[PDB]
Amino acid sequence: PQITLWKRPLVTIKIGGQLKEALLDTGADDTVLEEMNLPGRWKPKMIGGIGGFIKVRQYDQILIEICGHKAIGTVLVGPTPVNVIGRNLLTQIGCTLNF
Amino acid sequence: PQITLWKRPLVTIKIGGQLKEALLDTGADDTVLEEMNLPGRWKPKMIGGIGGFIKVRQYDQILIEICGHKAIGTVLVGPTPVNVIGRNLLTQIGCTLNF
Ligand SMILES: CCC(CC)CN(C[C@@H](O)[C@H](Cc1ccccc1)NC(=O)O[C@H]1CO[C@H]2OCC[C@H]21)S(=O)(=O)c1ccc2c(c1)CC[C@@H]2O
Secondary structure, eight states, X not given: OEEOSSSOOEEEEEETTEEEEEEEOTTOSSOEEOSOOOXXXXXXXXXXETTXXXXXXXXXXXXXXXXXXXXXXXXXXXXXXXXXXOHHHHTTTTOEEEO | OEEOSSSOOEEEEEETTEEEEEEEOTTOSSEEEOOOOOOSOOEEEEEEETTEEEEEEEEEEEEEEETTEEEEEEEEEXXXXXXXXXXXXXXXXXXXXXX
16 A cells, blocks of 8 residues: 555554554664563563663564555564554565655 | 655754754644753743653744754753754745655
């Protein structure tokens, strides 16, 4: 799709068999989701945003479908204010900025 | 133009007679720029993201040029670690997400 930006670019995602809403965030290097249950192993990781650093659970090679487009990559899980899809997965679904 | 997301979508902007580097950020409602002593009136604001909140100064009707595209709108100035062009200005230069 072509998505204008008068509203937040929110889309439905499928991860671990569960549907969720997430923000397409070109300013995020990484994909960070709010606390949830995800199967498999994970590693403690630190990520920094506008207000400082937080602890997250890093899940590697996770299947995630974004607006009908499949991706397989790293998903960070922790106290982010909102679910964000970052560039690590935006590149997989072929997302570009255009103006 | 078309900007891929392999790397951060950094562009040159002109604001307050100065050139800066900023991210084209679809995850930011509004624009947030590094500390700069802009002239005119402002109102305090608190904005939150990963890690918590920072204090910023809200300036209204500020002229910004983004890759030669002129825009005018709200700019939040404060100790942000990165300059981000948000949707309030991305809409004005005709920026869309496409996949
Ligand atoms: C709310 C969703 C989102 C935060 C998840 C909102 N952010 C925008 C998002 O793109 C930030 C931009 C950024 C900030 C610092 C350093 C680099 C990039 N990226 C982000 O945190 O990415 C994380 C995960 O990947 C990693 O890569 C980069 C950093 C790590 S914001 O900056 O905090 C913001 C902006 C305007 C405004 C607000 C909040 C409130 C009102 C105002 O309009």
